[PDB]
């Protein structure tokens, strides 16, 4: 229904951040943290972000991003993410991942950078249930995404022909 | 066994190329060519890639690029690509396609860029049946790849407990 268990958030990792060093935004991961706030404040579990490590030294290594990002892909309940151009490299593949994975997607569209996206994310939104929602202000975003949430959650996983 | 039916091939779209623009290196894709020849030589299928479009205007456009390399990453036998860093946007998301999707993998991994991705090429190898093939000159790589292509294969193809 529109009670997501778990929502899984990431971010573009790698992209966003130096190839495999640390230099991710505060003013990014506090936003994550809002989100995220709301989530594990409705009931929804965030899943697959690094929160700790991504406050203490994120950009992980392979070895964890890439075992917890799938992990989590599947272990999440609904995957929710954030573009961040460039194209979030450690989130495409995650967001690809949700492709096959078949699990709920939901990205928070980087009013702009979502568009430069457009590959992977829009072809995502096309071809499986990939809802996305635009952020000037996760403030916004959080209330765009959750309607987007449970109203794509729920076109997904409610009856598709006649009811 | 040693008989690749078809071999999936892709690169750093959107990455290597503009942000859904077109720019791709002439030297890059002939080079696809080379391997994509000894693929379609040998009797491996090349799936994926769009050459004709890669060759008159690639960077295709996610309602494209996003169905064929999904339908092309379930519909490939081997999972078969090229890093590039930047991380291989378009790539990347085929990749972790191909980690949730099962399809065995093995990437050319760019002696320098493979380095950079780490991530999940790297995440990959060692999550999933992900091989990491250095290539300095795809005249190597052809056998190269295609030595860890049907080794990788055979080592996820044959048994993996007791004979």
Chains 1, 2 share one sequence.
């Not at 993410?81 to 078949?102: K, L």
């Not at 997607?105 to 939104?125: C, M, P, Q």
């Not at 996305?132 to 022909?161: C, E, G, M, S, T």
Request: glycine residues 8%; contains cysteine; aromatic residues 8%.
């Amino acid at each position: 229904k529109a009670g997501v268990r778990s929502v899984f958030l990431a971010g573009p990792f790698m992209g966003l951040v130096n190839p495999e060093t640390n230099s991710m935004p505060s003013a990014e991961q506090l936003p994550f943290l809002t989100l995220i706030e709301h989530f594990e404040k409705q009931g929804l579990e965030v899943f697959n972000a690094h929160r700790r490590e991504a406050w203490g030294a994120q950009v992980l290594t392979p070895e964890e991003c890439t075992p917890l990002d799938q992990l989590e892909i599947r272990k999440a309940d609904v995957f929710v993410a954030i573009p961040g151009i460039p194209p979030s490299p450690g989130t495409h593949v995650e967001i690809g991942w949700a492709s096959a994975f078949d699990k709920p997607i939901v990205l928070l569209l980087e009013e702009g950078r979502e568009e430069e996206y457009g590959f992977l994310v829009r072809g995502l939104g096309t071809v499986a249930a990939v809802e996305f929602v635009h952020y000037k202000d996760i403030a916004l975003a959080k209330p765009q995404i959750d309607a987007a949430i449970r109203k794509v959650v729920d076109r997904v996983n409610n009856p598709a022909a006649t009811p």
